[PDB]
From a paper:
Echovirus 18 (E18), as a member of enterovirus species B, is a significant causative agent of aseptic meningitis and viral encephalitis in children. Echoviruses belong to enterovirus species B (EV-B) of the Enterovirus genus within the Picornaviridae family, which are single-stranded, positive RNA viruses (~30 nm) without a lipid envelope (nonenveloped virus). We describe the mechanism for the entry of certain EV-B serotypes by using FcRn as a two-in-one attachment-and-uncoating receptor. Protomers consist of the capsid protein (VP1, VP2, and VP3) and the smaller internal protein VP4.
Detailed characterizations of mature E18 particles, the E18/FcRn complex under physiological conditions (pH 7.4), and the E18/FcRn complex under acidic conditions (pH 5.5) were performed. The ectodomain of FcRn binds to E18 with high affinity (equilibrium dissociation constant [KD] = 343 nM) at pH 7.4. We found that FcRn binds to virions at its canyon site. VP1 and VP2 interact with domain 3 of FcRn. Specifically, residues T89, I148, P149, and K256 in VP1 form hydrogen bonds (H-bonds) with Q142, K123, N149, and Q143 in FcRn, respectively. S138 and T140 in VP2 form H-bonds with R140 and K80 in FcRn, respectively. All binding sites that interacted with FcRn (T89, I148, P149, and K256) of protein VP1 and T140 of protein VP2 were conserved, while S138 of protein VP2 contained an S138N substitution in many prevalent strains worldwide. The binding of FcRn had a minimal impact on the overall capsid structure. Rotation of residues around the pocket caused by FcRn binding initiates pocket factor release. Consistent with the SPR results, mature E18 particles bound the FcRn-decorated liposomes under neutral pH, and no further conformational changes were observed.
Residue numbers in the entry:
A (entry chain E): 5 to 17, 22 to 47, 60 to 98, 105 to 170
B (entry chain C), F (entry chain C), I (entry chain C): 1 to 238
C (entry chain A), G (entry chain A), H (entry chain A): 5 to 280
D (entry chain D), J (entry chain D): 28 to 69
E (entry chain B): 11 to 260
The structure:
């Protein structure tokens, strides 16, 4: 199966919301207003709060004042899969080796550097993708 | 004895230190060193070697021999479209990485020097054409027409007896060293190939020929800052 | 060690030479000594400016990285290793000194003053052996650790130092790791050529990351170590000096600031703090 | 730096200062000299 | 020059479109020096009996051919006095001049990386196990790469990689000569004796692999010769032989 | 081996030590040093540069461009009152601090040398006047009249073609070095400006002109004891 | 330190000299500089390749052995000592660097960054003295320890280092321990002359084993130490360079691999990551 | 460092010179090289025998004394100090190397790798300061300690070293302490002139005792330290070499042995382990 | 004092270090060194000494004097069968180990050089015969016939006045040093003895004679890597 | 390496560099010279 959190946020709105799909079925519906991982749950809530803070800092990272609908497909397929899209177009990906986001888009490097400024955020993403996502996938497969 | 003060940087295992150390086997008689051919003394000597570039990263075409072959064909279709187009940085560009030059750079953090891209024609001997390969320095977008390509640095390759014309891209970097990693600052230009003239082939010759790009390094090429390669990413114990 | 220029003897002057009367509009600071504008005595001044050089001013080592990495159990996370994209900006004390100059070519001594303290807890009975700490400088673009026990800690080519707690702090002289010929403490340009992307010094002088961890695999009870990386810029070849930073620093990625007064406000333009 | 404090040759420092290279081993391995200006074949 | 002639031993190789001869890493082959020697067995030095171009079996370059690899000291077993001396001697040193002849007309498209890779330790299709010798060394026929990933207790002949888990297109660091049918009708790689030890067993140790990997698949229009062979001739010049003993049962 | 005794001051990270240390990257090829213009080799070279002094620390006037402008006017009102009055110490005086000379001193604990205060007139070219700027050495109170100002060290500035007359204050310190911090001992004098003659302006010229003070350092200027600047006072992590 | 060759000045050329037009089919990499194919300026290049030599590339010390050996009670087992058949292959970081070359003659600095952490348990009250660790290199064919208190730890002839925790990591320069004149990082041959047996580098370069233990006999409560042997290959005389390993390593005895893409896949042959 | 003699070139010989045909009955080992009996080539051999000298063979330091001395309470006994009548025989690893020669004059480096581990117990809460260990070499005939706190530990003339746990192991170069001009590793004579008394090496080379203790008076809970004395015989002037010991050692006072096979038994005189 | 940085490899007891150390007894007057005959300065000098080889490892025959005696007899039975057959490696071969050369090698990990096997006849003086002793280099199987033995390296020993003909086996190793331990790679050849002619004895002379093999080392012999001997395997305290 | 930092001769380093050998003590101990080429007895 393939676990995929559909991270999404809007700079000028539900400011931030996650749609965790363990397979084609959706199992997690996180929202910024609630601040909790509404369908173990505490750790996922903390991780998604970190992701929400990263998305807010990414919104601050973009120089343009126009709307920005940031999206992402974070997860692991049992292999980590990180694909971030700005305004509905993929712009950056998280390199596991170098352990940092990037792409040809200038906004990709701006957001990657802004998230790198956050304390251990790149390694938080490394733990989330390489370790936390497969751990949650296996735990949910055994449980369900 | 002699008064000595333990300066900062003591009782530490710096990974990049050249400190001496007592030997495990004193007065050990090492095997006499024979003249083994191929004494590599610099990693750039390995980078300097023309190495086939997987230009064609298309899905399925990679993890194969279609990755290295640039499909150059006899046709009127998409001859004002690039034969290939990638970024010049051997470090983080998916095309120029994972080769002698690219993997050599990936073991470092800063690189410099001109890159020679040797384009070897693999087709029929009767096939004749002209391919214009252009390195565009950063500051503008990737070339979208051959008109935009000839403005920058370009080489016109006449397919023929040599058929291995090399675009030795220059060093137009703002800084002395570029960044191996994906850095928008001090990034390299873009390599785009176009059809100066269509490769005319006789009826007996195949229409679709191939091109192999060879990334190598010049006498001007150098790297500065050592680092662990991000390519490996060892999962665990072997 | 050349000392200051001695105040030359001077007397009453009614000449047409106007030392005081000059033009600072030209951009030239007046080179007048006290003798030029005042009648002074001949004093052989020995006030050496050796400690006032950029080599000595930057010679003082100041803390640049403060983070708390932990040793605990087998539930390895991102809190067991300290991650730092090596940048002077992190701590303001040395950031202001470096941002007193636009470009500085220097070899940087990195001293890791690791301070390990057991985290306060219900159970602290543990008697752990002397903790060994690995401080690895990952080159820019090289693989970075994902966990405290990842393959990236096997430093085949990445520089690293293993230091045992209780010894001298691990001092490693990192050479001039810059793509350019200097370190741009300020970079008025952008990351990308399209005038977009990241803005500031962070785009250039992309020094590779530094990862600190406990070489000891685990600890019966959690122990938090403060890495406290201090930088000593030596072999300074500083270029284009800049005024010391006025506004307090807000972020380590940009010079973005909350507007501050030029200087401490005073009651009136004629207000002099003086004894009564 | 050049001073060796141990009699064993294996105990000496890394020869970092030694910059030698012969790219002609791998970049110019042909038996007959191939001049850049001259045509390589015929 | 395009035309060339190599007269090593009894055999003689004549070429008309061959590219420049490559000497492996720039060192011409030579007999093991006394300063560089480790054995005192007075090795025999057949100047022409063993130092001659042995023509291996012709291999057809197909449109779907991924590539091939020969283990040279081994491939030449039971092929002339070089193989006989391999059987009869424990130690052996030789510098191999590999002329790979792949002739084609002017209407044939393709290019082969004919690279001599010293100690090209190949990977196994099932990584846990290790392939038998019948999968690495040529066994009545050269071993052929595979276009995609393969399984089973065989050599991982995936032409996707170089066979050692490494990039195939990066193999040009090792001495090589491309057979481009436009230019090259043959490739000439002169590899000196390349080994860590001064001499090693020619059956126990595989000195190198001649990997002929078509990067551009052979494409030819109909009517042209479909059977385009890739012959391999190898001349072990300076074929020194120490440790003379009973013939190995290989 | 050689008997060595660990003297006091061992296994310590003194912040002001010049001990050597093994390098992280041995035999690292640093980027060649180009001649970048502006090689600053002493911090006093930066202090020596005329730097506009925020003399007018009045509330509201600071955090603005009114802080640097000394408002000198054409009038009979308060012309026996100081144009400005502050303390000479660049270190702790709110006026002379937070500038090149002042912030340069704040990074040290002891300073010495003459300070040049260059007074640049910013007004109409037709405006003409005389301003008497006086440095009074410590021992008495701040000058309250121009009569008390001319007793000490004073310069009479004739507003005109130059209009940048500099009061290069002398070194009348009792000790070789003064204290950067607020120390009653070895403190500096006071800078007070007065109207030697009223600046007469034509009807077409503005009555209220301005003066900019530039704090710089002479060839005699030096500092002794390095310290962390009290200006920053970093709250926490950035 | 010889620098790179300076780019010679060049101008417009319509000559019969074809620098770009060459033949890479010959196996010769074209030696053309930018001046040869393009009109360039005369720049005196000072980009030294000192850190890009095999001596400096292999000079960086990278971890090669990670194992956890334990101190606990009197029930001595195989977990109280760490066993390693000394081979670069174990950790991939330095394995790839070494497998960038077929043969390398070098003296190998072996630094043991021992990190002792008490194993998490119900009772951790113990206050053990400073742990002393013995790192003995058993020569190939020599006796190897069967237990943590075996006779083989009495190093009459086997090299060994006793290191006290908290000091500088134990650095021992092992000389060129090879039967041949180099280390075969790749060995395309077999172990036996009958074309059978073990295949790969493991047959040759049979470096002797390394055994690590706690010189302290026992500990009131179990303490796990991570040996973390790091290798620094110095005095490099590398021969026959090889491309850096593409596929991730699966085993430390063979180069057996799961097929990997040549390089990162891209959308199309004309796909260039560029700012919009 | 003189290398081995190069194999001289040889050809077919039908002369009356019989190199192979010699007489080992004379007690002379034949000095024939491969050239003498076989036709060989001229190889310049550089196989140095530097590491194969008695200086280098004995240079490897091997453990010679293993004992457990304890720190506990005030009930001082004989278990608080480790006693050793300094003799190479104790540990077989170096005993065999020394018993490869009848007489050896050498200065002996004595390295004490003390490993202190708290004895497993119900209560291990103690937090003891860093243990200091005294290693005193009592001269032969000098007073020896009766308790851990006896007057003999006051080393007025007996050599001693105080080592703090966690530092480099205490290495003391003991000089040539022998009444004779060599050390008799074997002494075929008796202790007394009446052909009685003690038999063996123990009678001569009567090296003085070595006593190891904790300089710390007591420990809240018992801690056992393993002294692990390793010997490095340097400045070797070995005389009368002997074959390496065949039978396993049974006692450290005599060469008394349980009869062992000359060598590993094999199926038949014509049995060769060979690949099929 | 002098600033010193604790380099890696500090506070460690490397077993193979030549570091100096303070002496227990300073200014100790060592006993004057007399010229004791038999000064052994290299372990290979001991290896170079002809030492009787327990060729006959047959069960029961070992742990006795039958181990060293090679039973060569006057008969027609099994005269096309090897007199003896073992492996040449003194390190791990059960026959050539546990002797001066073999035990000397067992204390090391890498060995090199020619081995002289001196074959001493122990029989009646009237006995006369010819024994062909052959060292076969690796690559093939152990010799099974004298025809396969004479192909490799062989010596024909004519039993007579000398009766101590030595097969000085050559160095036909692929590498400069072989492995002392049981390594299939860089292993040595095989020593097999055969009856070139049957040893004819008079009726008064015994039919079954003996041969003693003496393993010694040449001037070319050397070892490289020190190690602890696997022979001892000390069980515990003595 | 050759420098000795302690006055005691027993404190010096191991004489690893000293490669001396007289195999004629044990391999050629006969009183009368025995030449390899010449017959050993008579």
């Amino acid at each position: 199966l393939s676990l995929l959190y559909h991270l999404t946020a809007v700079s000028s709105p539900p400011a931030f919301w996650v749609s965790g799909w363990l397979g084609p079925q959706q199992y997690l519906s996180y929202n910024s207003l609630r601040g909790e991982a509404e369908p173990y749950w505490e750790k996922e809530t903390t991780d998604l709060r970190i992701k929400e803070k990263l998305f807010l800092e990414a919104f601050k990272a973009l120089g343009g004042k126009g709307p920005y609908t940031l999206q992402g497909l974070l997860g692991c397929e049992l292999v980590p899969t990180a694909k971030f899209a700005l305004n509905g177009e993929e712009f950056m990906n998280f390199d596991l080796k170098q352990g940092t986001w990037g792409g040809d888009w200038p906004e990709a490097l701006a957001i990657s550097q802004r998230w790198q400024q956050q304390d251990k955020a790149a390694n938080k993403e490394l733990t989330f993708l390489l370790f936390s996502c497969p751990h949650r996938l296996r735990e949910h497969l055994e449980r369900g | 004895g002699v008064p000595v003060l333990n300066t900062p940087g003591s009782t530490q295992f710096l990974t990049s230190d050249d400190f001496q150390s007592p030997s495990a086997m004193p007065q050990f008689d090492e095997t006499p060193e024979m003249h083994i051919p191929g004494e590599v003394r610099n990693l750039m000597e390995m980078a300097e070697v023309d190495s086939v570039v997987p230009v064609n990263n298309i899905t399925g075409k990679t993890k194969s021999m279609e990755a290295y072959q640039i499909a150059v064909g006899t046709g009127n279709t998409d001859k004002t479209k690039p034969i290939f187009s990638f970024q010049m940085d051997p470090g983080y560009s998916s095309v120029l990485k994972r080769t002698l030059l690219g993997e050599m750079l990936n073991y470092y953090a800063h690189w410099s020097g001109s890159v020679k891209l040797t384009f070897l024609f693999c087709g029929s001997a009767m096939a004749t054409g002209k391919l214009l390969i252009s390195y565009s320095p950063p500051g503008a977008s990737v070339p979208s027409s051959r008109k935009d390509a000839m403005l920058g640095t370009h080489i016109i390759w006449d397919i023929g007896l040599q058929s291995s014309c090399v675009l030795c891209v220059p060093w137009i970097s703002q800084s002395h060293y570029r960044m191996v990693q994906q850095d928008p600052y001090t990034s390299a230009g873009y390599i785009t190939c176009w059809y100066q003239t269509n490769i005319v082939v006789p009826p007996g010759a195949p229409t679709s020929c191939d091109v192999l790009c060879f990334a190598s390094a010049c006498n001007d090429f150098s790297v500065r800052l050592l680092r662990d390669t991000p390519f490996m990413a060892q999962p665990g114990k072997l | 060690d050349r000392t200051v220029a001695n105040t030359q003897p001077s007397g009453p002057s009614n000449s047409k030479e106007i030392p005081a009367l000059t033009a600072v509009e030209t951009g030239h600071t007046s080179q007048v000594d006290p003798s030029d504008t005042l009648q002074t005595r001949h004093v052989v001044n020995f006030h050496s400016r050796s400690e006032s050089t950029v080599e000595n001013f930057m010679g003082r080592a100041a803390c640049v990285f403060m983070d708390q990495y932990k040793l605990n159990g087998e539930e390895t996370s991102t809190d067991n290793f300290a991650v730092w994209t090596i940048n002077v900006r992190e701590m303001a004390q040395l950031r202001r000194k470096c941002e007193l100059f636009t470009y500085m070519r220097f070899d940087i001594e990195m001293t890791m003053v690791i301070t390990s303290c057991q985290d306060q807890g219900t159970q602290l009975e543990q008697d752990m052996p002397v903790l060994t700490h690995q401080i690895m400088y990952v080159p820019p673009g090289g693989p970075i650790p994902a966990k405290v026990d990842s393959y990236e800690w096997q430093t085949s080519t990445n520089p690293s130092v293993f230091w045992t707690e209780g010894n001298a702090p691990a001092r490693m002289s990192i050479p001039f790791i810059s793509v350019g010929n200097a370190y741009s403490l300020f970079y008025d340009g952008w990351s990308h050529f399209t005038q977009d992307g990241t803005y500031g010094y962070t785009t250039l002088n992309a020094m590779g990351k530094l990862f600190v961890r406990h070489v000891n695999k685990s600890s019966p009870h959690q122990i938090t170590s403060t890495i406290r990386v201090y930088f000593k810029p030596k072999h300074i070849k500083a270029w284009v000096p800049r005024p010391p930073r006025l506004c307090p620093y807000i972020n380590k990625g940009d010079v973005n600031f909350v507007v501050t007064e030029v200087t401490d406000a005073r009651k009136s333009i004629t207000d002099t703090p003086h004894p009564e | 730096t050049n001073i060796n404090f141990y009699k064993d040759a294996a105990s000496s420092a890394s020869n970092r200062q030694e910059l030698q290279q012969d790219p002609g081993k791998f970049t110019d391995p042909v038996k007959d000299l191939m001049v850049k200006t001259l045509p390589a074949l015929n | 020059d395009r035309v060339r002639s190599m007269t090593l031993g009894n055999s003689t190789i004549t070429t008309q479109e061959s590219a420049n001869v490559v000497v492996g890493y720039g060192e011409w082959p030579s007999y093991l020096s006394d300063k560089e020697a480790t054995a005192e067995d007075q090795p025999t030095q057949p100047d022409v009996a063993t130092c001659r171009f042995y023509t291996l079996e012709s291999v057809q370059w197909e449109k779907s051919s991924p590539g091939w690899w020969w283990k040279f000291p081994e491939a030449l077993k039971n092929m002339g006095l070089f193989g006989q001396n391999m059987h009869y001697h424990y130690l052996g040193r030789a510098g191999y001049t590999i002329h790979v002849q792949c002739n084609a007309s002017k209407f044939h498209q393709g290019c082969l990386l004919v690279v001599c890779v010293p100690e090209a330790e190949m990977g196994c299709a099932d990584t846990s196990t290790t392939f038998p010798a019948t999968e690495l060394t040529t066994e009545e026929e050269p071993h052929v790469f595979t276009s995609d990933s393969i399984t089973g207790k065989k050599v991982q002949a995936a032409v996707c990689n170089a066979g050692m888990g490494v990039g195939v297109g990066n193999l040009t660091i090792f001495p090589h000569q491309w057979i481009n049918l436009r230019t090259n009708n043959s490739a000439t790689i002169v590899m000196p004796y390349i080994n860590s030890v001064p001499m090693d067993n020619m059956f126990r140790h595989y000195n190198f692999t001649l990997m002929i990997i078509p990067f551009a698949p052979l494409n030819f229009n109909e009517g042209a010769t479909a059977y385009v062979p890739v012959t391999v001739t190898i001349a072990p010049m300076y074929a020194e032989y120490n440790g003379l003993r009973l013939a190995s049962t290989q």
